[PDB]
Ligand SMILES: Cc1cc(O)cc(=O)o1
Ligand SMILES: [Ca+2]
Ligand code: NA
């Protein structure tokens with residue numbers, strides 16, 4: 314279907330935002346990703362844009378006025394005066410107050426919405442924003458290290474010109490905030506693959522299928538610890554092929570959270586970078602306008618490898634396994650290679666479990682017109 318035009322979004326300030334001592338979310342990983350892919354030469358093959366800052370008003374296309382007014386006002390120096398509001402909006406613990414919090418949200422969001430506009434205008438085939446994908450944020454509260462739902466805002470932009478939009482989420486966590494926003498409409502189908510059972514955020518059972526006009530337009534594949542490349546590959550291409558056939562979307566959003574990789578500080582899966590990136594290859598073959606976003610990922614050397622390789626896949630550009638010199642070279646020892654090995658952890662997802670869940674999801678997809 315030909316090679317694709319790619320527009321990529323990055324702000325050089327993004328890596329300086331700091332969630333605080335000990336916090337696993339590290340914006341620096343987006344700077345590591347950028348520096349690695351520049352050193353592979355991938356800037357020669359794509360257009361690189363700075364995101365604009367999304368305004369408070371633009372954010373209220375989804376979020377409440379009261380929540381956005383609070384996010385644009387709260388600072389470490391005035392926290393004591395805002396104790397009540399912090400609790401209501403779920404800020405100040407897992408989702409801390411840090412210097413420049415609102416600006417970080419504006420740049421994360423700006424990349425996703427700018428990419429959506431470029432796709433709507435038919436000025437690109439693919440848009441990429443590795444600072445986006447913050448899928449847990451809700452209408453009026455922060456959740457799961459996410460404050461503003463850049464994904465929901467980008468999908469609302471795509472819906473100006475697309476009757477049906479497909480959302481796919483390969484982060485290890487359930488895409489709860491995106492699913493909730495579109496739970497009662499058939500104009501967005503949401504498809505999430507995730508660890509389920511005594512795990513954050515607690516939602517995404519296979520029996521969660523949507524409601525009202527949106528019944529059968531939410532799809533959830535719950536998984537156990539230790540899934541590997543073979544098992545994930547067993548089910549991803551067949552599921553997405555059936556969704557494409559039945560739903561017939563005109564645009565796609567793919568959240569590429571890297572916390573589903575082997576060795577993640579918070580995750581419990583066993584995928585390689587090649588296994589994760591096979592998902593990008595499958596979605597790209599349908600030749601639809603595609604927005605590719607970031608997400609979780611807590612072992613930062615592997616996040617940089619994953620998103621560098623997935624940028625190369627979007628470009629159909631082969632790159633060597635030997636890493637080029639870069640500003641973070643020491644982070645990639647002791648091997649200094651791009652690709653990673655799986656661990657010897659047990660895969661609790663039997664082949665029979667994988668086929669049975671797939672078969673139940675196929676039953677629900679037969680209910681589409
Ligand atoms: C992404 C996330 C958020 C959180 O509060 C706990 C966790 O384990 O993972
Ligand atoms: Ca997911
Ligand atoms: Na929906």
Ligand SMILES: [Zn+2]
Nearest residue numbers: 484486572609
């Ligand atoms: Zn996650």
